[PDB]
Amino acid sequence: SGRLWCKAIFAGYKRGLRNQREHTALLKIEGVYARDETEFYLGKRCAYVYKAKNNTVTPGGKPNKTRVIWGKVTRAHGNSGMVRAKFRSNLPAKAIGHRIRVMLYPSRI
Amino acid sequence: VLKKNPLKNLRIMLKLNPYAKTMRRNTILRQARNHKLRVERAAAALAAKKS
Amino acid sequence: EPYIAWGYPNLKSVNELIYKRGYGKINKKRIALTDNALIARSLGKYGIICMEDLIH
Amino acid sequence: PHCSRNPVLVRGIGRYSRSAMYSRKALYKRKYAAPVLATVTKPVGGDKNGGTRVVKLRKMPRYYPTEDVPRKLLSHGRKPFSQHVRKLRASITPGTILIILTGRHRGKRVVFLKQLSSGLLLVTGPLSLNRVPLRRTHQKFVIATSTKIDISGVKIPKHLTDAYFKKKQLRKPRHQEGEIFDTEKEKYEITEQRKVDQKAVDSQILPKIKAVPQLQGYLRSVFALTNGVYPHKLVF
Amino acid sequence: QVLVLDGRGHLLGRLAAIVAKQVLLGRKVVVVRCEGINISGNFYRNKLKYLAFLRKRMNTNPSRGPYHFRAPSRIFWRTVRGMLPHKTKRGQAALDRLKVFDGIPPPYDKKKRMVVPAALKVVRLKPTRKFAYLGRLAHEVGWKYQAVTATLEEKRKEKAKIHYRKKKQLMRLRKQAEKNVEKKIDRFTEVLKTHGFLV
RNA sequence: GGAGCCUCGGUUGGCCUCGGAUAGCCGGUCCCCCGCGGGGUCCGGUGCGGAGUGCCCUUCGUCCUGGGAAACGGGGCGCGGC
RNA sequence: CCCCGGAGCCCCGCGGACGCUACGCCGCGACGAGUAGGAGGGCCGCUGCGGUGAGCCUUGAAGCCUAGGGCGCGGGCCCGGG
RNA sequence: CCGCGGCGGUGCGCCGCGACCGGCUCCGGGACGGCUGGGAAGGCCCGGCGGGGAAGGUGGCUCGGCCGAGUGUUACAGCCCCCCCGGCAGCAGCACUCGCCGAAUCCCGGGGCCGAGGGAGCGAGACCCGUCGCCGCGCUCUCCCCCCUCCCGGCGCGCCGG
Ligand SMILES: [Mg+2]
Ligand SMILES: [Mg+2]
Ligand SMILES: [Mg+2]
């Protein structure tokens, strides 16, 4: 009856200064800021969840306007608890500075 | 042929050098032996502390 | 000198290099030492008939 | 048909040796001094006039395709799911409590009953409390809370297994084309055996849960992440 | 869902740095009491440094050239604008989240407002070092509304002092209330200090 | 009150002293001064801050009946005045 | 101590691919910047000739156009509709 | 037609799992060697031998209630410290993490990630298939016994006989 996903912001792509490598998102998971606090989140399912003009299908549901791009937090990115993700398609860039949901549900807990 | 890494893949190590089996049979047993003997020292030290 | 790092390897170093990255030169084709049949075929005329002999 | 005369030391390393095993197995004293045309192989039947007829079991085929794929390469260690070995997070012990993370019973709290043959969990958030029946779940989509009921001596039915907790309907042909055929059928009906199973199991648990104060009320409630509380910080 | 940061006691660029990254991660921020921002380095030092910035103008038509904003809010906005990619769409979007004020006006004058302790003067500077209030600085470079901003803030502080007195009054009654009731909240109050509050 | 294109972000709230930093916070004044408060002194508590943002508030299944502790609290987008 | 028109086959010397356009097919290694310049291969492309497709074509050739479907690293190509 | 029997290729579209191997990156455990056959330490205390700061001391002065606090001097040990002789098991590169270098003197278990890329059956009365090398084992064709007990059988949940 509430929220079963931890909040996270799409920081932007894995990139060098002047070559962005679009196939790898970086994820600022809310409340975690140490390459330490982040072994929880390794290998968790994550959703860029967004809605669009035309209708879609929906697993166990009637046709909707919301769509998602699924992905997976792979590894911890640099000291201050950023995390790398990788998504079944690359994230839009429209997406920068927006929510992506890091689930709990490939749990090892 | 795929190179399976001997150092991870026990049976590949054995294929290349069968004396590994024994060397590793020893150094499980050896380490267990000594681990037991450490507990036995620790129990005697606790008994000496109680006395 | 300023093109290399070098020095005196351990026993373990010689093992780890040979087992993890031991590749024969066998008819000028870099081939991985998957069996002693390879080492023997080439070095067996010296008494070297296995990975272990090679390491020694 | 004796068992394994050397035990396991490590996966792939027996405790003993070659030499100890020779003595244990006793290879001394167990020394075994041991120094078509006309006749048709596999056909045969009966029959009347002329005589008997020679049939041919497994008769050579009446169509060959123009091209067909050519075998594989044996491949060593690739077992089918049934023959697999099954794991279980040490956290999940019998009569522990879970938070089911994924399904319709989502965030609902539950009691764990057993690991089935499959490797799935069997589960019950006693239908009574939670509205969660006898039900399968996966280790991987479940949080093993550090809260246990003592469920030791409850006789879960032997007959309830993977095979029973398994979906049922739909065969092939029928009328098919039009605006009909198995878009209806409509409802999974609960059945009476299923209701009887639940009734039996819950009663054994249900007293046990209650003994723990507030536990029923905990098992009524639903888990969810509020503000300021982060999975990685908190424990369950 | 929104940062409100009391810019008093902070350091101009030090705060701006932190605000920029918040703003780039979609956080809507408000920065309040910007005149109270204070800049390291003795006053005179910084005045000249500003006065130089004033000199910078497009010779042939100043009307185009770098617009030197006087108000401390706009100054602080300028320095945060200098740490975003503000020529991009995403950069421009980022600034649109940030909302700066000389003094503290009516939405936020009854909101609790945070303090970035990593931009704070008492922490980041040696006590023997000198600094400048961005107000004074703003005032002398042409900011019109110092005194107005002061006269409105004396009202606010008087208005707030009242709120605090009433708040205190409730807190006090609540401390009394517990003592009045502490045999019929005793086996609740016990359980809230087994799991470790109330201590 | 009914449908019906489109644009999206969101997925508990926090309704506030002032400020200090080689110091502060709270009480209570027995006592004194000022306009229930404000200022003072004195005393008593806290101070790696539990009158803590390391915080607080809020609960997250629905109902039934039939006990206890808690109990006049909540509502009708309840209605008029200050 | 015997014969494969039958040992039943992990090797079979009695006969031999699903494979064998031998300018074919298959396996192992290694390597791959490039102006000027050189060489190879182009089932890349244009126009005409000898051969050849019991080719195609008024039941619609060439050309032209195409937010149609594809192939090829590419030169290019093939189909759908007009 | 029902068998979804056996084999072969497949999935309309979106999904998930599982175990096996390869390559990685981490985590947790343990067991060893060497040294100034580590240095320091700890613990028990005993006998001596000096030296230093500076003391349950004394003393000038100061500050508080003979006592407590703050400076100052000569300096023994009744606060300690340091050297020297002689001797105990508790040490152990020590979870009292004070300072190394390592591993035929080294092993076990666990997590995250990416990838699977090949295809030694095209016979007419007898497999549509295994498997090579390595590990051992495991088993049996050898007898013994012991235990537990899952199925089944028997006797009184207990005991006895795969
Ligand atoms: Mg939604
Ligand atoms: Mg080249
Ligand atoms: Mg050229």
**Phi, psi values for residue E135, rounded to 5°:** -55, -75
Chain G bases having any atom below 7 Å from a protein CB: 3, 5-7, 18-19, 28-30
Beta strand A66-77 with E28-32 is: unpaired
Å between CA of D130 and C1' of F68: 25
Strand, helix or coil for residue D26: coil
Structure tokens at E95: 């600034």
Contacts of D26 by beta carbon, 8 Å cutoff, 6+ apart? none
Burial of A44 (0-12, 13-18, 19+ CB in 10 A): buried
Element (H, E) at D132: strand D132-137
E78: number of Cβ within 10 Å: 16
In the chain, the amino acid numbered A50 is Y
**Cα(D175)–Cα(D109) distance, integer angstroms:** 44
Q: Give the DSSP per-residue string, C1-56.
A: -TT-------HHHHHHHHHHH-EEEETTEEEE--SHHHHHHHHGGGT--SHHHHH-
Nearest CA in chain B to C34: B3
How far are the Cα atoms of D173, E36, E98, E130 from residue E6, in angstroms, in the given order? Answer: 73, 9, 13, 21
Cβ atoms A8, A101 nearer than 8 A? yes
Which residue's structure tokens are 């029959």?
D47
Q: Evaluate whether E100 touches E75 at the Cβ level (below 8 Å).
A: no
Phi, psi values for residue D123, rounded to 5° = -150, 155
Q: How far is the CA of D126 from the C1' of F2 (A)?
A: 43
User: What is the β-pairing status of strands E2-6 and E28-32?
Assistant: parallel
CA–CA separation, D196 vs A32, rounded Å? 48
User: Within 13 Å, how many C-alpha atoms sit on residue C40's CB side?
Assistant: 7
Residue type (1 letter), D69: V
Lookup: tokens for D174? 């029928």
D27 membership: H or E segment, kind and range: none
Per-residue CB contacts under 7 A with strand F, chain D residues 105-144: 129-131
Name the packing angle between helices E89-97 and E72-81 (round to 10°).
Answer: 150
Estimate to the nearest angstrom the gap between the alpha carbon of E155 and the chain centroid: 18
CB A13 within 8 A of CB A20: yes
Q: What residues contact residue E133 under an 8 Å CB cut-off, 6+ apart?
A: E35, E36, E37, E38
* Cα–Cα distance measured from residue E81 to residue E12, given in angstroms and rounded to the nearest whole number: 12
Is the distance between the Cβ of C25 and the closest atom of strand G smaller than 7 Å? no
- D94: CA distance to ligand 3 center in Å? 77
From chain C, the residues in CB contact with B7 under 8 A are 16, 19-20
Which of A1, A2, A104 is opposite residue D231, by nearest beta carbon?
Answer: A104
The helix or strand, by DSSP H or E, that contains position A97, with its residue range, turns out to be none
Q: Which helix (H) or strand (E) holds D194?
A: helix D192-211
Question: What DSSP letter does each residue of A15-44 carry, written as one string?
Answer: E-SS-EEEEEEEEEETT--STTTTSSSTT-
The C-alpha atoms of residue D33 and residue D48 are separated, in whole angstroms, by 54
Q: What would the two tokens of residue A86 be?
A: 């990788």
Q: Taking each helix axis from N to C terminus, what angle separates E72-81 and E12-24, rounded to the nearest 10 degrees?
A: 60
Q: Do B1 and C34 touch (CB under 8 A)?
A: yes
Q: At a CB cut-off of 8 Å and minimum separation 6, what does A102 contact?
A: A5, A6, A7, A8, A27, A29, A41, A44, A45, A46, A73
The partner residue sitting opposite B7, judged by closest CB among C20, C34, C52, is C20
Beta bridge partners of E4: E30
CA of E142: how far to CAs of D110, E62, E71, in Å?
69, 17, 8
DSSP state of D131: S
Tokens encoding E117: 């302790």
Give the DSSP letter of residue D183.
Answer: S
Match 């997070």 to its residue by tokens.
Answer: D89
Distance, in Å, from the CA atom of A48 to the CA atom of A103, rounded to the nearest integer, reads: 11
What is the stated resolution of the deposited model, in angstroms? 3.5
Q: Which two tokens stand for residue B44?
A: 């005697």
Q: How many angstroms separate the CA atoms of A94 and A52, rounded?
A: 13
Q: Which nucleotides of F are covered by protein (CB under 7 A)?
A: 6-22, 26-28, 37-38, 50-53, 55-61, 69-71
Planar angle of CA A94, A97, A103, nearest 5 degrees: 100
β E28-32/E99-100 pair status: parallel
CB atoms within 10 A of CB E2: 12
Eight-class DSSP state of D45 = -
User: Is D232's CB less than 7 Å from nucleic acid strand H?
Assistant: no
D-chain residues near A60 (CB < 8 A): 104
Chain B: nearest CA to D73, how far in angstroms?
A: 13
Cα distance between residue D66 and residue D64, in whole Å: 7
Handedness of CA A3, A7, A13, A14 (dihedral sign): negative
Token pair in block for residue E143: 């900011």
Amino acid identity at C37: A
B1 interface with D at CB cutoff 8 Å: no
Is residue C38 a contact partner of residue C24, using CB atoms and an 8 Å limit? yes
Distances (CA, A) of D36 to D39, D40, D46, D59, D144: 6, 6, 21, 17, 67
With the CA atoms of D208, D214, D218 and D219 taken in that order, what torsion angle do they form, in degrees rounded to the nearest 10? Answer: 30
Closest CA to A30 of D228, E30, D226: D228
In this structure, which amino acid lies at residue D109?
R
Are A99 and A7 spatial neighbours (Cβ–Cβ below 8 Å)? yes
> Does any strand G atom come closer than 7 Å to the Cβ of D67?
yes
Cβ burial, residue A47 (10 Å; 0-12/13-18/19+): middle
Secondary structure (DSSP) of E53-79 = HHH---TT-TTTS-----SHHHHHHHH
Choose among D160, D148, D153: nearest CA to D93.
D148
Tokens representing A11 are 């920081």
Q: Does A4 touch chain D (CB under 8 A)?
A: yes
CA angle E136, E138, E144 (to 5 degrees): 105
- What gap in Å lies between CA A4 and CA A105, rounded to an integer? 9
In SS3 terms, E162-196 reads as HHHHHHHHHHHHHHHHHHHHCCCCHHHHCHHHCCC
- Asked how this structure was determined, the answer is cryo-EM
- Residues 6 or more apart whose CB falls under 8 angstroms from that of E174 comprise none
E188-CA/F45-C1' distance, Å? 26
Angle at which helix E89-97 crosses helix E12-24, to 10 degrees, equals: 110
| Cα(C24)–Cα(C41) distance, integer angstroms | 11
Q: Which residues, other chains included, contact A6 with Cβ-Cβ below 8 Å and sequence gap of 6+?
A: A29, A30, A31, A41, A101, A102, A103, A104, D225, D230, D231, D232
Min Cα distance D224 → chain A (Å) is 5
**Token pair in block for residue D97:** 């409590």
Sequence length of chain E is 199
d(C-alpha E164, C-alpha E184), whole Å:
30
| Residues D121 and D115 sit within 8 Å (Cβ to Cβ) | yes
The reply to whether the CB atom of residue D233 sits less than 7 A from any atom in nucleic acid chain H is no
Phi-psi region of E125 (alpha: psi -120 to 50; beta: other; left: phi over 0): beta
Distance between CA atoms of E154 and E159, rounded to whole angstroms? 8
The nearest alpha carbon in chain D to A7 belongs to D230
Q: Which residues 6+ apart lie within 8 Å of D124 measured at CB?
A: D110, D111, D113, D132, D133, D134, D135, D198, D201, D202, D205
Question: To which residue do tokens 């006090």 refer?
Answer: E172
Q: Is the CB of E109 under 7 A from strand F?
A: yes
> SS3 of B50, please?
helix
User: Which ranges constitute the DSSP H helices of D26-180?
Assistant: 127-130
Side-by-side strand order, sheet with E99-100 = E2-6, E28-32, E99-100
Closest partner residue to E90 (CB to CB) among A9, A11, A96 is: A96
Measured between alpha carbons, how far is C23 from D16 in angstroms, rounded to an integer? 34
Q: Do B6 and C19 touch, CB atoms closer than 8 A?
A: yes
Nearest to A36 by CA among A84, A85, A79: A79
Among partner residues A3, A32, A104, which is closest to D143 by beta-carbon distance?
A104
Cross-chain Cβ contact C32/B1 below 8 Å: yes
Q: Report d(CA D229, CA D219) in Å as an integer.
A: 21
- Helix (H) or strand (E) segment spanning residue E39: strand E38-40
Asked if D70 CB < 7 A from strand G, the reply is: yes
Which pairing describes strands E38-40 and E131-133: parallel, antiparallel, or unpaired? antiparallel
Paired strand residues for A102? A6, A46
Residue with tokens 């036995």: B40
